[PDB]
Amino acid sequence: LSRLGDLLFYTIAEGQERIPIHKFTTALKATGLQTSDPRLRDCMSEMHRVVQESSSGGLLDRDLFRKCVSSNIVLLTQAFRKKFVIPDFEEFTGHVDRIFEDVKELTNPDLWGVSLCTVDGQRHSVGHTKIPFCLQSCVKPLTYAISISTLGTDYVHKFVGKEPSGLNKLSLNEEGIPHNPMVNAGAIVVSSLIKMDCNKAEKFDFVLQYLNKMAGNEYMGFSNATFQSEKETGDRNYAIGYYLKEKKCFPKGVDMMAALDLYFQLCSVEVTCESGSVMAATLANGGICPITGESVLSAEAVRNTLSLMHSCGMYDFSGQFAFHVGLPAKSAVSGAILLVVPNVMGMMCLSPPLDKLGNSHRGTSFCQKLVSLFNFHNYDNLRHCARKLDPRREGAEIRNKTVVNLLFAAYSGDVSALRRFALSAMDMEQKDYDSRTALHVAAAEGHIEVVKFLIEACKVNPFAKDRWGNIPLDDAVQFNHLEVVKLLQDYQ
Amino acid sequence: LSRLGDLLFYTIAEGQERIPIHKFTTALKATGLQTSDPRLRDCMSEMHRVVQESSSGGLLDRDLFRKCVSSNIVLLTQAFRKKFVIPDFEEFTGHVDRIFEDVKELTDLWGVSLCTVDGQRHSVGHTKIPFCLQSCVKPLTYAISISTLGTDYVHKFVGKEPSGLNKLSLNEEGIPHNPMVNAGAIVVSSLIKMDCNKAEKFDFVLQYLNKMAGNEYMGFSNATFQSEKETGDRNYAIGYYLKEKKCFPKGVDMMAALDLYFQLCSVEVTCESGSVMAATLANGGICPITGESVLSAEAVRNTLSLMHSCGMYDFSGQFAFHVGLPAKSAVSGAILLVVPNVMGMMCLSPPLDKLGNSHRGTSFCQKLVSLFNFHNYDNLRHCARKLDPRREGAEIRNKTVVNLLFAAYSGDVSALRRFALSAMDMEQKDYDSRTALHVAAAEGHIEVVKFLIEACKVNPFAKDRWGNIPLDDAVQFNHLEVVKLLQDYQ
Amino acid sequence: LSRLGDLLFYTIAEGQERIPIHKFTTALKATGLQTSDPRLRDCMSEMHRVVQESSSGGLLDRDLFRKCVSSNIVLLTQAFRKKFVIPDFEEFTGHVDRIFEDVKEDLWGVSLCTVDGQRHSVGHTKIPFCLQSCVKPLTYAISISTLGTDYVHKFVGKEPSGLNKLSLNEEGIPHNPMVNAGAIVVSSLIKMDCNKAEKFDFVLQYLNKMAGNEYMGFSNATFQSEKETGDRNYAIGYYLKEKKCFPKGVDMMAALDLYFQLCSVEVTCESGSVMAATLANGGICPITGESVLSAEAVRNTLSLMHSCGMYDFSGQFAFHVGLPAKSAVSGAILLVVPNVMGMMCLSPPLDKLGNSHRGTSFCQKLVSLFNFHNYDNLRHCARKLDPRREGAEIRNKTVVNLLFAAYSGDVSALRRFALSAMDMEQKDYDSRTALHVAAAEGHIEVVKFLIEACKVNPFAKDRWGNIPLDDAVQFNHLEVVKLLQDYQ
Amino acid sequence: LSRLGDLLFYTIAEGQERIPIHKFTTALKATGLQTSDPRLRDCMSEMHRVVQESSSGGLLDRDLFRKCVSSNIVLLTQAFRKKFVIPDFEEFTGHVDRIFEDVKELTDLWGVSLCTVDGQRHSVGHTKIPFCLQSCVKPLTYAISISTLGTDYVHKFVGKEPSGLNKLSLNEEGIPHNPMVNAGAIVVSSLIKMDCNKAEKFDFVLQYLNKMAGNEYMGFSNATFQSEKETGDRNYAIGYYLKEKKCFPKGVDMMAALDLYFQLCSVEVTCESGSVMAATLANGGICPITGESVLSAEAVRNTLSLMHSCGMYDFSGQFAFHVGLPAKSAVSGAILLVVPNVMGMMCLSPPLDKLGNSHRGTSFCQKLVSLFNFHNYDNLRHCARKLDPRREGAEIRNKTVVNLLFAAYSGDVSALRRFALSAMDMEQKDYDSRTALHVAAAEGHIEVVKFLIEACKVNPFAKDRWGNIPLDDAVQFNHLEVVKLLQDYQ
């Protein structure tokens, strides 16, 4: 079949047929795809092989490119066709950069970093993003997602609730189970449901097996210093664990200290921001890892977890986060916040300083400045973006589209449609590709019934100069009609 | 001369030379839009006037058909291009009737209505029966307050988080928990323009509700206005407590403010009018069917966030999990529901459950979101077993002629190269009857014109109604270099 | 029938056989009874009649007593016989005066009425003040007696709240009559078929007998107020209306209105002190002896007044003071010392917990010095004084048993005194000790224990100058002399 | 001289010259005191010593009776003068057995024991069966802490007021609610001498409980000490939380604390031994039957105030109202009762109520207080329908010979005049063969002598043991005025 691989090369090769692979590496990082991306592992392999077989020793041509690429071409076109979920990435990251650099004033204070992974695998990172940190209680949804997928939607919720507590605060819901999996009592109970017929060592690696697919096989360590600690200092969880033992809310035939010990292992799992960003991007992508395409979690599992981060993710501040930011998140005592922008991207941030409610100061400030500028809120309308940008669509696409539809209804007499653009505060002064406007477009025919609304209602300035410098008065003379001309002399 | 405008006759007529009028109404009935649509009255009036007077009588020819449908081509092409949010409306509602009969088995007055953000309406069951907005005006009242006053001012007198486990409870700030309970509904109702009498105050809010509703039916039932003022024991109890704590603003009478909340609760609507108000919240503060900016952007966002969390009283938490759509219920048996960026809905079933929410309504909503991929945190792309009627497929952001002409204006050849990969045809013409070539020729971009003539094999002999050859336009701009290259083609 | 009336005159008249009645007034105020006492009403009319008729012009002899004095003799002897519940009253009030003046370091007063009718007042006790929420126990007592214990508590609880405070108990009724919700409900249980004017006087009828017909005013300025400002109670009343916790066929606005009348009832400290002495007694007023309240009405009111009476000191007051009390925003506290006395205090300055500063400080200093706490042991008073018994009563009694046990050779009993921290160096009327008693009888085992265990000082000198060694010469016993010679 | 001990023979013997021993056993059994009473052992030994080593055997003559009882007359006379707090003991317990049978029809271990503050003991039912003080040691532990440490120190680490909210929490200051719930019981156990090992810690408290009990039976059941350490999930949950919040003092570990608290909870007593510990709280920190100052005055006051409100778990509010006595219950089925200044009591019945109190034991307490005036706010004098065996009406402050002698010493004639009003004879005498006149004669008060000689006609020449006529003392003191007045009689 005459596959479009040659067409891909033509877009890449603006000039001669012989292009270096070094030039192919750039314009692939422009789309925010790293050279080391797993999704294109089978592509870069043959590119390095050709250094010896080819006489030119590096200068790729059109024919050789087709053979190396394969059924994965569909993903390869999408990157250069700008059909990912965030085109104009170079500008998008630049705005993520200015937000990041702005909050430096807001007070290891030097530790300050944020990373992000788009649902299409596109990614960017700024600041100290490669300093590992523990997922201190950030693994509660990860554990809950693993349990709910493998066991069933009802089984996991016979033993823990699905709605917040409203007040730490060791207590149970009305039914006799912990309020939600986002608190210690629920996180401990759900942790005890995973692989109940296995030992401590085997259970931990099975859960950790689900990680590194959630994380796309970036770094995932199991630190011991945090594991030895928090077992001597885990009095809060010992109190919860014994309380949960007393209230008999564990499953039948389950050890309690063993369940606690596994829970302490998970909290000690150490990740960087880059690996953290790729994590929860699989949550955005509905249980399928973006950076590799592996189906990690079930469809319901990623639905249930995201609703719970919205409710209980940020502890006491969850109510305000659900209002000012309206994104699922999960915070840690380490000073790092997990963030999910469903259908768009996943993001993780790091700043050690922490505010009174268990959340980072810079981290929460960053999430606020972000949603305020990029239409990310859950109930922000996608069509009427207002001053907020929509990275889901390439820049100026909506701005140019509105003009073309506005100018379209010249001669058929669609008077009514003009009202909605005007009454929606849409600017009538926008100039199209040829410097035309609905006033210029309609003023050519000289039928007063249409242009009458524009002057009377919109009060639009008719003194604008087109690219040719001609005024509609000359156009009317060019079309042999004088009646409309009388109205034109008015307004001054 | 003939172009995409004309196909409206061909697609409806199947090429038939003359069509009956009832075909157009039946065809237009599909795709959702109703004959009485505020944006289609021109066609209805223009249809009856000429047809009954013209000698042609009950037959529509091409010239006759074009002018009658000429008034609303932007909507009619949108409806017939299937550019609406739900282009499978004939079958999307076909699902809704089977679910409607399904909830009958579980448990006389049962009706549901819907209205998409593009104005597509459907209704089944007793949807015309009026009923009182007992509690559904709480978001609507709160939305009005945000727009004129603001979120910072409105929330000094009320919180923004669920209360949980129940009156006479306040947050740590000394204000009611949120505007979605009786306590918070009173305080926001008091905030609305405390400088005019009660009667004018009611009509101000009633004016918004009609604009939010888009001028469909509304009522002000006095048989519930008085029957509550003589029975609102809990409301009176709440009101007295608020003024003790100085919760109301300065210079506000509790009895007047507490009477206004009673006036609004007594407003009467149907499923049809209510669904449009819901669809006004889905559409970001613009009526789907009349296109006015009734509300501010920040108002509807705050309204939906609180409707999601605090909407359904005690069942709010479970509803945000199984269904995840902002909603609001009332003792009358009606559930308001908002699907952001998609549609709005309203149900009605007088029987209720122990938690104060309608059983058929909540049964219907659960059976809906489980099938149509509408949950807030359900994902696009990976629909799983759920149907996704928001798009037949491909992309709603596919190739268009607009990006070319502005790409030519800006000199972004790379975008043109990206468009070239999609086997895009350059022959699609707007008013210009010109491809991207002229704009680059006018600008003088040397690389763009060379790319277009060679890479795409564009016709240089394209005519235009304005009567100027592309070479002539370049002459005024002194693009001498462009002249030589273009002339070399022949 | 040789009645003991003439014996009363002899103790009253230490001198000649004809005494002026002016001297009878004094020594009747020393016992803390006022000349205006209702119990001796008939006496006052009779005494003044013969002051003018008698040729002596006031002098009173024995023969008059047997005729004019009457059934009130049994009470009249009780005052001079010191058989009331608080003898040595002149010293007792001096300490209450001491506490009063001490807490000072402009309106400040306290009054007290003993359960036997005895009474004292100091400060600004005569300035009237409203009875704001101090009527809550009084209305509950009136309601609980007339209706029944089961009826009144179908509609209000008997439990505290420990938390304004708008909520109901688990059963669906307000927690207790000591809160506004419970206080308003009990108000609605009184005289179902009567009107606002008739109900209020029937309740006020009880209050007048409660106070022994002392001043009972119904101010209007506070009644007009608290109906405009009663939003808290309107909120409660409508709340109680909504919850349907009122009795069948009862209007809510009227029940609220009656409640506002009671709070506006105005009393002085003197009148308020006689109040809380009726229910210090078992529903019998001391100053009149009339049965005001039922037996199982003062038991319930005091139990609830202890639990819930004070507002936020309730837990601490039941610990540091342990007395039923009720406080008001006016700055006045009602006190009950069951079986002892009633009491009321006044100081406007009110602390952050809704209770008076000087008032609560006074109750602290009082109970700390006078054995009034509920679980203070009566027999082992420690450093706390006991007004129930006259001074030097137990102290002298312990000496006699300590010295008498020595005579019997009761060595075992002597262990209890010493090991109970009691001072064994106590001197009797004639300066003897147990060592002296044992020395006389020659109980060798007794004297040995005192020297070894008690370490008694042998330097004690009797009034005659005799030393225990000298008594040996009187009776000529040798064996104990050798033991006595030791220890020095 | 005629010592009062002879009257004890006459009243027991009814004037009979010779008494059998078995008569005395029943006679002393009445008035409450048991043969094994620590304060009556000397009489019992001397009673048995002569009987088994004399020809007379089991018979007591007057001289034999006087010398044997001489060591214990002050308590034996108290028992036979009916000076005990319950002089009607033979019938007071006769009531207790009928109530005992009446409650013994509800739904078997059922036993009750009592001990008065004067050491009168009675028991009925299975009172000898031991059981563990599961929760009843909470007041006892708290009392020990107050005495050595103080109320200010002990309550820095625990509040002093109930909770009403089983519920791991803290009142308002980062400390447990009260020492009567499991959370507060643990903190006080940690406060007791945190400078020595666990085992010595247990025996220090056990030493107090022996003295509070007065040396009756106690046990240390290890089958409950271990069975709670391997099952005390609630206690471990509470303990872990306390150290997180730094509620324990400095230099304390939760490991030791729960070990001690389970040791104390596992101490074993019977109804008899427990009742005396209760009666030790009645008598203000002194054992009734042995007279040791085990506790401080402020310790038992604080203990009883907290036992009143917090003693029962959730039935306490309804218990402080219907019964009003300080009490304490345990899962074993035993209720500890303290009737201040009267007696202590302990019950035992395994089956419980919904709130963890014994059904057959709690009904008995209500049926008791309803009949015997013991409610904290029942009134003396006006007993209503309730029996009052405390003093059956009489004045405890009745006239005595002691007041005359000390009144004579101080010269307060008015007190003597008050005594004279009662027609009482001033010839009542102490051991020393001296009436009030001798004391007055020694002092030389002129007015007192005139009152005594005439108001009562008392002999002034009565002989005395000390062997000197009072006139001779006056002659020694040169009270010439007294001489002539005294001589005027002859």
Numbering used by the authors:
A (entry chain B): 69 to 175, 190 to 249, 252 to 576
B (entry chain C), D (entry chain D): 69 to 175, 192 to 249, 252 to 576
C (entry chain A): 69 to 173, 192 to 249, 252 to 576
From the paper:
The glutaminase enzymes GAC and GLS2 catalyze the hydrolysis of glutamine to glutamate, satisfying the ‘glutamine addiction’ of cancer cells. All glutaminase enzymes share a catalytic domain containing identical active site residues and a conserved mechanism for hydrolyzing glutamine to glutamate. Here we demonstrate that the ability of GAC and GLS2 to form filaments is directly coupled to their catalytic activity and present their cryo-EM structures which provide a view of the conformational states essential for catalysis. Filament formation guides an ‘activation loop’ to assume a specific conformation that works together with a ‘lid’ to close over the active site and position glutamine for nucleophilic attack by an essential serine.
Several high-resolution X-ray structures for KGA and GAC have been reported; however, thus far, there has not been a structural determination for the full-length apo-GLS2 protein. Therefore, we obtained a cryo-EM structure for wild-type, full-length GLS2. Figure 1a, b show the 3.1 Å structure of the human apo-GLS2 tetramer and the relative positions of the key regions for catalytic activity (i.e., the ‘activation loop’, the catalytic site, and the ‘lid loop’ that opens and closes over the catalytic domain). The stretch of residues Gly248-Glu258, which has been shown to play an essential role in catalysis and thus referred to as the ‘activation loop'23,34, is disordered and flexible in the GLS2 structure. In addition, residues Tyr182-Lys188 in GLS2, which correspond to a loop in KGA and GAC forming a ‘lid’ that needs to close over bound substrates for catalysis to occur, are also flexible like the activation loops in the GLS2 structure. The C-terminal region of GLS2 contains an ankyrin repeat motif consisting of three pairs of helical bundles located on the distal ends of the tetramer, which is absent in GAC. Each GLS2 dimer within a tetrameric unit shares an ankyrin repeat bundle connected to the catalytic domain through a flexible linker. Interestingly, the ankyrin repeats asymmetrically occupy the area between the N-terminus of adjacent monomeric units within a dimer, showing a preferential association for one monomer over the other. However, within the GLS2 structure, the ankyrin repeats appear to hinder this movement and thereby may prevent the activation loops from adopting the positions necessary for maximal catalytic capability.
